[PDB]
Amino acid sequence: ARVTVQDAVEKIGNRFDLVLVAARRARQMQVGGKDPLVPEENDKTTVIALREIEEGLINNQILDVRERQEQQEQ
Amino acid sequence: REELNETNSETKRKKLTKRIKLLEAFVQSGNKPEWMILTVLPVLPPDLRPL
Amino acid sequence: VKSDDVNGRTKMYKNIVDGNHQMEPGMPESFNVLLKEIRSLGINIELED
Structure with a gap:
């Protein structure tokens, strides 16, 4: 597994919002309605969300923009 | 206070x-x-003191 | 979860069965119990909003 977490800390900086973003992605994946942007390898949603966030694709603004677009499209 | x-x-x-x-x-x-000197005394809700 | 929650225990068990992963804070029963203990002794227990 991903033993150490340093890339997510650098990608967030505050180190307290990174876990929040990871958990927000994980809960959304668990409930459904979302697709993993990164190629999954039969693992937990937490690890997949962490990898997607650290890949430079998920942020506190990307998720918010996507949610706003989805809400406005209704 | 003045005194x-x-x-x-x-x-x-x-x-x-x-x-x-x-x-x-x-x-x-x-x-x-007067609130320090009590008037009506509350008894325990019976499920507060097990038998 | 690892505390005195009863109605939260049932909700959490149901969620774990359903894979929801959510806990409901509410208010601890021991809090109201201590409030009563205050009301049990010579002081009213009243919590503002």
């Missing part, structure tokens, strides 16, 4: 001023002094 200000200092006047300030605050608070 404590009018008092001639020392520990007695200090205690008097403290009591006066405390009274002024408790008056500013909605604290009934």
